[PDB]
Design a protein around this ligand. Structure first.
Ligand SMILES: CCCCCCCCCCCCCCCCCC(=O)OC[C@H](COP(=O)([O-])OCC(O)COP(=O)([O-])OC[C@@H](COC(=O)CCCCCCCCCCCCCCCCC)OC(=O)CCCCCCCCCCCCCCCCC)OC(=O)CCCCCCCCCCCCCCCCC
Ligand SMILES: CCCCCCCCCCCCCCCCCC(=O)OC[C@H](COP(=O)([O-])OCC(O)COP(=O)([O-])OC[C@@H](COC(=O)CCCCCCCCCCCCCCCCC)OC(=O)CCCCCCCCCCCCCCCCC)OC(=O)CCCCCCCCCCCCCCCCC
Ligand SMILES: CCCCCCCCCCCCCCCCCC(=O)OC[C@H](COP(=O)([O-])OCC(O)COP(=O)([O-])OC[C@@H](COC(=O)CCCCCCCCCCCCCCCCC)OC(=O)CCCCCCCCCCCCCCCCC)OC(=O)CCCCCCCCCCCCCCCCC
Ligand SMILES: CCCCCCCCCCCCCCCCCC(=O)OC[C@H](COP(=O)([O-])OCC[N+](C)(C)C)OC(=O)CCCCCCCCCCCCCCCCC
Ligand SMILES: CCCCCCCCCCCCCCCCCC(=O)OC[C@H](COP(=O)(O)OCCN)OC(=O)CCCCCCCCCCCCCCCCC
Ligand SMILES: CCCCCCCCCCCCCCCCCC(=O)OC[C@H](COP(=O)(O)OCCN)OC(=O)CCCCCCCCCCCCCCCCC
Ligand SMILES: CCCCCCCCCCCCCCCCCC(=O)OC[C@H](COP(=O)(O)OCCN)OC(=O)CCCCCCCCCCCCCCCCC
Ligand SMILES: CCCCCCCCCCCCCCCCCC(=O)OC[C@H](COP(=O)(O)OCCN)OC(=O)CCCCCCCCCCCCCCCCC
Ligand SMILES: CCCCCCCCCCCCCCCCCC(=O)OC[C@H](COP(=O)(O)OCCN)OC(=O)CCCCCCCCCCCCCCCCC
Lengths: 175, 98, 347, 106, 48, 291, 171, 83
């Protein structure tokens, strides 16, 4: 069963997406995005992306989603709603989970489903690589190449972040 | 394609529909805009990591920085909308119908 | 804004567009769009009112949706080709997503609903950037991916845009609403000819920008934003009404003005490929645009609407607005038809 | 497996210690105790501080690969781009500082 | 002091890497024989 | 066998935190010319037991779920921070151990947000938003300082900090960073003069354990691992005692002043020292090995 | 498509080097200076041929030189070597710097009983050259023929005949 | 000059924290260019062998490529040991 941990993790990924996509109060909305973000990091970890997965926790969850919850607490109702207590929120949740469960059924039963693309359900491990014994992490070498190879990426990315600060101070000044 | 792609593509679609089907809180839609980015981060990282395309390893990081920079701008607009009306309801943004 | 910051923000708007135009990598195309959107939100809010904030929010939501679909199409393309080169896409689903992302960014119908509302909600100077400079970056991408674009999709959007733009303008008395619908209708011509000859898509883009800039520049000179406020122009600057008439007749595609040139060259390129019905339908439908342009000339230049007593006090003061390049722009907008063969410089 | 077992234990033990802490008190059966728009309001300063954190945090993610970046043969380019990122991190702060973004007087 | 120690650590890493380089041929040869043997084994059960 | 190891880590942590409360009250007392607990058990050694029992039998919201999640998140994540600590051998040996701790520490700010949110009081919420702003502000210097230190170490591995300091503690080459790090941990743990309970005190010990490793590295002899643990424990205890020492001797900051303490003193100086420590290994030819 | 060719199990057989990783690590420096010739021929084969099948004989000589190497030690220097790799095996990282005394004893042993010299720092990382008789793989990637290029437009650029020839324009 | 030593003396009195930061950042930017040991950093990074050193087929005219790892030819790390 652990042989399909990446598929099991990706099923919870979708359920968490159905969570905040059905759009309960923006406070359970942010809780579903946190669970999916953490589950989403788990998938990246199992593919060899240790640094990319940890960048999700450090930046996405501990940075972006913190500011979302912070902003949500300052300007949004303050009182949540019992999850699924609203008809539309509950109707979309069941609809999503039904399609999530039906896709899971036909792919595992038939080891294949066809929705826009062709999907094969033999497992995710079957495409893994069978050759590496280098004494370094390839992820780390690729990311570390940013400062040598990606001079142009750094410049535009740096400028955008500086301009983000300038832009956000203008937007909120009010005169 | 592999099986995990089925669900990462399912999650992008779910958050796309969630984004285009509004309710009332403008905050609830910005989270759908960030669920879309999260799915695209995971989809890209799996492709790049599995294919061993080393220099592309920094693409997910750049995509994460820019999208978060976007969300910072989106939250700022939400806060300015909240000032004018006391709530982030999207039905209060209908002045420009005429 | 502090004038120095305003200049830097404008150069970031330009930098984002240029990054898209010079990039051979799909991530840098996405980054240029992201940077471009980031810097244009400031100039839309710069007068601070509920309408300017509504326009900026509606713009942000629309453009942000388009960029996530663009990134999704870029990743699908990577999965199926293992490369990032800005060129034809290697998956039909990637092409549908990119074409719809660019259509949303252009405001093409049926992704058009934001254009009239966002344009009405911001200043004239900001609207000029929205309807002119903002078309370059999406257009230059459509220019390079066109060999893989779905013909029924690109032609479906173009026809829809020529109809929606023409009909939507008939019911408008707001000059910013009129210009927005004019922009939608003109986008429809540029993408109709793209599958056949991308050069004639650049020709129509250049000439549309030149004439659209001339209009906004002339609206800004007298600070006129409604039909009735523009109808006072004859009693302050009579020269401006003549230039407004000429430019509006040019935008209508009437010979021998410069605006006839793009429509002329597109019909030629479409018939060479045995497209007879579509250019005939398109050209007839453009008569809607000429109608609500002609309405504007009636209340501005060809009749004299009633004036006000306080208009007498304006006669004593001169225009102090910069009106940069207006004399050159108006002469390119009206008197360029004899030099039509010069379009080869765009080849 | 080890990490998953450790996380499961840590958050299972926390869960147990939380529920029983919610239920052990009801052993006493204490007597019933009769105790019968959308802005806080919020100040724009507490919003800017969070956003400035986010934007600086993003620029930190760009610096995290620095320990690995020093291992390259193109050290002149690496050093120039590293000092570029930190300096613009300082430039952003100097803009915040000089435009009173870092104040608390209303 | 940090400079002296870090230089000494780089030298140890070079020696550590060089021991690997000396052994890579022997590990590469056995990896080849394990891959082909596994493929040959799979082909037999495929035939049946 | 692994399950014993995780139990042999959690239970001592809870016992250590329980008796840290005793040490706090006696250490503060003697600095204040009094004694502190010396009646409940000899030298007060049973005071933590008495407090615990009393607390759990005492008589005991806007969101029921969030009122349950908040204690679990803080308590679960406080214990998780200990799994990669080389003492000298980590329970979980991670190549990105330092990066893991920054990530988990960041999530700690959620319990503050959720607990304030679940309170139901507008007043309670803004108090939480002030606490969240203090934390994330001072997470900036922790991350940048830690990055500056790791440029002399060479990786994100926590056991590599042991090897980095084989000849000499990093406090000597990095005392200006250690100063701002130590204050940032107090602000991060919302300790005096930045105080504007189990999970809270577990972080306090863990942050001081992490400080000893980062700046006061203990020599490790593989044949006698227990000596490292003793020396390691002593260094962390004294660092924890210095938290008590600092609390007794200072008044409290104002909220705007501690924001100013970071945004206008630590961050400008922390940025410059980051630049300095990127350049220094390159110009001295003392770049550490990547492995 | 064709049938993937696979050598039979009989051809894949060879006497293994059944010593643990710390045993290899301890002999690695001497091993890389004694068995360099057969080692480098196998690696030149692998990089040149890009095919594990085309280098199965060369890989058997790698084992033969490795087995012989470990017998040289077992015949003269067993105890100093056993004492040395037992020190390496203790460390979790299998560090060299923790066993410099036992490494020393092993070095004088081989330098007296066998005449071996430990390569200096940087030696095993040199790019060397190998004399081989195996023919160079001419088309290792098994490429097809490349498609023919389009004709090269050549000649003098004369002005366009009668100008643009666009509708009625005479220039 | 002396109009400047009075400026510097004023900031040293009113903003010591910033004077230190701007002093350290200037040293960080400048010293790497003026240091004689910055070249050894490039060499040491270039001397670390991550990959296998693939041999060269010995056509017959490669005089400076060694035939054996212990041969005199080829680059040497002698500077590294003394350094
Ligand atoms: C190297 C040099 C690079 C040159 C570009 C520099 C960019 C910064 C602009 C500098 C500037 O405007 O002065 C600051 C200045 C700051 O003063 P401020 O007090 O802070 O502003 C007060 C209000 O807040 C704001 O003022 P306002 O509200 O009273 O009205 C502003 C209005 C004032 O009135 C006008 O400027 C209208 C005339 C400009 C429109 C015509 C442009 C040319 C059209 C193309 C055909 C040319 C052939 O000017 C604008 O609308 C600004 C944007 C206009 C550009 C529209 C883009 C058209 C598409 C061009 C595509 C083709 C490009 C390649 C060719 O703003 C001005 O109003 C300048 C007016 C006088 C100087 C004009 C110099 C610039 C003229 C436009 C150059 C067109 C190049 C494309 C620009 C692309 C932008 C996205
Ligand atoms: C080599 C590049 C080839 C292109 C050469 C372009 C050089 C002409 C530059 C003119 C210029 O400075 O822009 C006028 C620039 C923009 O002012 P504006 O309000 O848009 O209109 C001109 C003013 O009325 C002008 O009023 P103003 O009394 O202030 O006149 C001052 C201006 C002299 O005023 C002028 O002469 C500006 C009028 C020149 C024509 C505008 C530029 C057109 C560029 C060529 C466009 C060709 C279109 C394609 C040709 C048709 C297709 C074949 O003096 C200068 O510009 C000093 C020359 C420094 C260069 O004004 C100024 O120069 C300073 C104010
Ligand atoms: C100092 C310059 C040195 C110099 O003088 O030598 C150059 C030239 C004479 O040099 P050349 O050695 O004898 O060799 C050239 C031959 O003359 C002529 O040899 P070509 O025929 O082989 O080359 C001309 C050729 C290629 O040349 C061209 O493409 C452009 C031709 C125009 C050049 C005119 C000179 C510009 C000054 C007059 C502007 C006034 C415009 C009216 C506005 C009045 C406002 C007061 O013509 C065409 O292919 C285009 C045919 C007409 C296109 C009409 C497009 C339809 C929409 C516009 C209709 C609107 C009514 C016309 C008004 C606009 C004027 C076209 O200067 C002239 O005197 C221009 C002669 C006009 C020849 C045009 C050909 C017949 C087309 C008649 C159209 C009606 C306009 C006639 C205007 C004439 C007024 C003077
Ligand atoms: C808020 C609560 C957070 C609780 C922790 C979440 C998991 C953190 C895992 C992590 O980053 O470990 C780093 C560590 C870092 O390890 P590493 O990258 O240093 O080394 C990996 C091992 N080597 C070096 C040999 C390659 O991850 C690993 O150890 C690798 C993955 C191991 C298998 C675990 C996969 C699943 C991960 C947990 C999924 C959780 C889903 C989300 C739960 C709900 C939301 C919180
Ligand atoms: C295949 C695609 C996979 C994704 C689909 C699976 C579901 C994923 C969750 C996405 C749910 C989106 C719908 C929720 C929503 O936004 O509803 C908005 C709107 C009701 O909004 P409200 O203001 O609350 O009520 C007004 C009613 N008079 O809309 C409504 O009228 C309520 C409708 C709720 C039922 C939603 C049905 C699923 C969405 C359509 C998917 C089609 C693709
Ligand atoms: C204010 C300053 C704004 C930012 C500009 C200053 C940045 C300075 C630091 C970068 C200088 C370049 C450093 C360098 O030498 O990189 C060389 C790099 C290739 O590296 P190399 O080792 O030489 O190997 C050859 C491989 N091509 O080759 C490269 O890739 C360098 C190409 C970089 C392009 C530089 C042009 C930037 C112009 C746009 C700036 C955008 C942001 C600011 C925009 C201003 C507002 C409009
Ligand atoms: C070049 C090759 C292609 C050929 C196509 C033809 C191109 C021509 C158009 C190009 C653009 C040029 C525009 C010409 C502007 C003419 C302005 C003018 O002549 O004066 C306008 C007049 C002056 O008003 P005032 O300010 O009082 O000055 C009095 C002096 N003390 O203002 C007034 O007194 C008010 C006038 C009342 C309104 C009259 C409306 C009719 C105007 C007809 C001219 C415009 C025609 C444009 C269409 C092209 C025609 C073919
Ligand atoms: C005095 C030096 C010392 O601490 O003794 C060293 C001894 C073993 O040596 P060791 O430090 O492990 O190895 C050095 C190279 N790695 O280790 C030991 O003696 C055991 C530890 C006893 C000494 C305690 C460590 C020094 C005090 C630091 C505690 C933190 C005080 C914080 C005060 C700041 C706040 C005001
Ligand atoms: C010099 C290089 C060679 C080194 C050799 C040694 C020579 C050292 C000479 C250094 C001289 C530097 C002098 C700089 C002084 C700082 C300017 C200044 O006076 O700022 C004062 C002002 C005070 O602010 P405030 O207290 O809020 O208001 C007054 C209330 N009484 O504050 C302000 O005006 C706002 C300014 C804030 C921005 C300054 C900090 C920069 C941002 C942090 C990054 C620090 C690293 C520097 C990065 C720059 C690129 C290197």
């Amino acid at each position: 069963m652990m042989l399909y941990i990446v598929f099991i993790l990706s099923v919870i990924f979708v359920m968490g997406f159905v969570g905040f996509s059905s759009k309960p109060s923006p406070i359970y909305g942010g809780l579903g995005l946190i669970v999916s973000g953490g589950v989403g990091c788990g998938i990246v970890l199992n593919f060899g992306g240790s640094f990319l997965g940890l960048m999700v926790f450090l930046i996405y969850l501990g940075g972006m989603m913190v500011v979302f919850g912070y902003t949500t607490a300052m300007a949004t109702e303050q009182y949540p709603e019992i999850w699924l207590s609203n008809k539309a929120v509950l109707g979309a949740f069941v609809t999503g989970l039904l399609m999530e469960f039906f896709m899971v059924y036909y792919v595992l039963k038939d080891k294949e489903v066809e929705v826009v693309f062709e999907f094969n359900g033999l497992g995710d491990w079957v495409i893994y690589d069978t050759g590496d014994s280098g004494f370094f992490s390839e992820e780390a070498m690729g990311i570390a190449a940013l400062y040598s190879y990606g001079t142009w990426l750094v410049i535009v990315t740096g400028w955008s972040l500086l301009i983000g600060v300038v832009v956000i101070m203008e937007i909120t000044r009010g005169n | 394609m592999s099986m995990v792609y089925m669900n990462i593509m399912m999650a992008f679609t779910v958050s796309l529909v969630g984004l285009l089907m509004y309710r009332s809180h403008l905050m609830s839609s910005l989270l759908c805009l960030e669920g879309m980015m999260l799915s695209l981060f995971v989809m890209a990282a799996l492709t790049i990591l599995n294919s061993h395309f080393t220099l592309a390893s920094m693409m997910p990081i750049i995509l994460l920085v820019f999208a978060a920079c976007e969300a910072a701008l989106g939250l700022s607009l939400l806060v300015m909308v909240s000032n004018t009306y006391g709530t982030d309801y999207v039905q209060n943004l209908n002045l420009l119908q005429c | 804004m502090n004038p120095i910051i305003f200049i830097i923000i404008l150069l970031t708007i330009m930098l984002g567009t240029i990054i898209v135009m010079i990039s051979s990598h799909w991530l840098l195309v996405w980054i240029g769009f992201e940077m471009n959107m980031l810097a244009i939100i400031p100039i839309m809010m710069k007068n601070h009112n509920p309408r300017a904030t509504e326009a900026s929010t509606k713009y942000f939501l629309t453009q942000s949706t388009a960029s996530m679909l663009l990134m999704m199409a870029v990743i699908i393309n990577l999965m199926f080709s293992g490369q990032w080169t800005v060129m034809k896409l290697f998956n039909p689903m990637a092409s549908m997503l990119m074409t719809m992302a660019l259509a949303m960014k252009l405001g093409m119908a049926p992704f058009h609903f934001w254009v009239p509302e966002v344009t009405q909600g911001i200043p004239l100077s900001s609207g000029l950037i929205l309807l002119t400079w903002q078309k370059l970056a999406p257009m230059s991408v459509l220019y390079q991916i066109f060999p893989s674009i779905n013909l029924n999709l690109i032609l479906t959007l173009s026809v829809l845009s020529i109809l929606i733009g023409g009909w939507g303008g008939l019911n408008q008395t707001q000059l910013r609403k009129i210009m927005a619908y004019s922009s939608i209708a003109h986008m429809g011509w540029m993408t109709a000819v793209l599958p056949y000859n991308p050069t004639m898509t650049l020709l129509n883009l250049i000439i549309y920008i030149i004439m659209t800039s001339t209009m906004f520049t002339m609206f800004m000179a007298n600070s006129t934003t409604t039909t009735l406020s523009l109808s006072h122009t004859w009693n302050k600057t009579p020269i401006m009404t003549v230039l407004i008439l000429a430019t509006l007749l040019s935008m209508g595609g009437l010979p021998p003005l410069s605006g006839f040139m793009p429509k002329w060259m597109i019909i030629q390129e479409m018939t060479k490929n045995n497209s007879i019905i579509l250019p005939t339908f398109m050209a007839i439908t453009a008569l809607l645009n000429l109608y609500f342009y002609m309405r504007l000339t009636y209340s501005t230049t060809l009749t004299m609407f009633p004036s006000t007593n306080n208009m007498k006090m304006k006669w004593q003061f001169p225009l102090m607005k910069k009106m940069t390049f207006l004399p050159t722009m108006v002469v390119l907008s009206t008197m360029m038809l004899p030099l039509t063969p010069m379009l080869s410089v765009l080849e | 497996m080890n990490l998953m077992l450790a996380l499961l234990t840590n958050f299972t033990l926390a869960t147990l210690l939380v529920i029983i802490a919610f239920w052990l008190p009801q052993l006493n059966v204490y007597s019933e105790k009769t105790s019968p728009s959308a802005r806080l309001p919020f100040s724009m300063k507490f919003f800017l501080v969070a956003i400035t954190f986010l934007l600086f945090d993003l620029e930190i993610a760009l610096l995290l690969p620095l320990p690995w970046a020093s291992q390259t043969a193109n050290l002149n380019t690496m050093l120039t781009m590293a000092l570029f990122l930190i300096i613009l991190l300082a430039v952003s702060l100097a803009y915040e500082w000089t435009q009173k973004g870092l104040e608390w007087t209303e | 002091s940090m400079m002296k120690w870090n230089r000494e650590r780089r030298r140890l890493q070079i020696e550590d890497f060089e021991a690997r380089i000396a052994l890579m041929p022997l590990l590469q040869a056995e990896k080849d024989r394990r891959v082909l043997q596994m493929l040959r084994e799979n082909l037999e059960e495929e035939a049946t | 066998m692994f399950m014993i190891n995780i139990l042999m880590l959690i239970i001592p942590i809870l016992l250590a935190v329980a008796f840290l409360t005793l040490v706090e009250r006696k250490v503060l007392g003697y600095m204040q010319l009094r004694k502190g607990p010396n009646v409940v058990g000899p030298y007060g050694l049973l005071q933590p037991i008495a407090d615990a029992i009393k607390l759990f039998i005492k008589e005991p919201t806007s969101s029921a779920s969030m009122f349950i999640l908040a204690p679990i998140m803080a308590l679960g994540l406080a214990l998780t921070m200990w799994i990669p600590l080389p003492m000298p051998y980590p329970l979980i040996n991670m190549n990105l151990g330092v990066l893991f701790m920054l990530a988990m520490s960041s999530l700690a700010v959620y319990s503050i947000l959720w607990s304030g949110w679940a309170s139901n009081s507008k007043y309670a919420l803004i108090g939480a938003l002030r606490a969240v702003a203090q934390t994330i502000s001072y997470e900036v210097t922790l991350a940048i300082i830690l990055l500056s230190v790791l440029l002399m170490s060479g990786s994100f591995t926590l056991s590599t900090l042991i090897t980095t300091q084989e000849q000499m503690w990093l406090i000597l080459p990095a005392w200006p960073l250690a100063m701002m790090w130590f204050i940032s941990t107090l602000a991060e743990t919302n300790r005096a003069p930045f105080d504007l309970f189990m999970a809270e005190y577990a972080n306090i010990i863990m942050m001081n354990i992490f400080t000893a490793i980062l700046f006061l590295g203990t020599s490790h002899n593989p044949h006698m691992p227990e000596l490292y643990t003793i020396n390691f424990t002593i260094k962390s205890l004294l660092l924890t005692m210095s938290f008590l020492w600092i609390r007794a001797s200072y008044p409290r900051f104002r909220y705007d002043q501690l924001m100013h303490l970071l945004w206008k003193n630590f961050l400008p100086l922390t940025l410059a020292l980051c630049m300095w420590h990127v350049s220094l290994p390159i110009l001295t030819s003392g770049i550490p090995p990547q492995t | 498509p064709g049938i993937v060719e696979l050598p039979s199990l009989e051809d894949l057989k060879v006497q293994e080097v059944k010593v643990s990783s710390s045993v290899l690590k301890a002999a690695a420096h001497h091993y890389g200076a004694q068995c360099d010739k057969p080692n480098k021929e196998f690696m030149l084969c692998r990089w040149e041929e890009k095919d594990p099948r085309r280098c199965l004989e060369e890989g058997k000589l790698v084992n033969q030189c490795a087995l012989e190497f470990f017998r040289q030690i077992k015949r003269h220097c067993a105890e100093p070597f056993t004492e040395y790799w037992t020190c390496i095996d203790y460390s979790g990282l299998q560090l060299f710097r923790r066993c410099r005394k036992q490494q020393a004893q092993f070095d004088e042993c081989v330098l007296d009983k066998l005449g071996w010299v430990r390569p200096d720092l940087g030696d095993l990382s040199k790019v060397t050259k190998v004399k081989t008789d195996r023919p160079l793989p001419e088309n290792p990637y098994h490429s097809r023929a490349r498609p023919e290029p389009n004709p090269e437009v050549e000649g003098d650029l004369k002005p366009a005949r009668h100008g643009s020839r666009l509708f009625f324009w005479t220039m | 000059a002396e109009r400047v030593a009075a400026f510097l003396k004023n900031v040293w009195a009113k903003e010591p924290v910033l004077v230190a930061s701007f002093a350290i950042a200037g040293l960080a930017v400048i010293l790497p260019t003026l240091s004689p040991y910055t070249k050894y950093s490039l060499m040491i990074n270039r001397a670390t062998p991550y990959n296998y050193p693939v041999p060269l087929r010995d056509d017959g005219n490669m005089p400076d490529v060694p035939s054996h790892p212990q041969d005199p030819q080829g680059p040497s790390l002698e500077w590294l040991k003394r350094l």
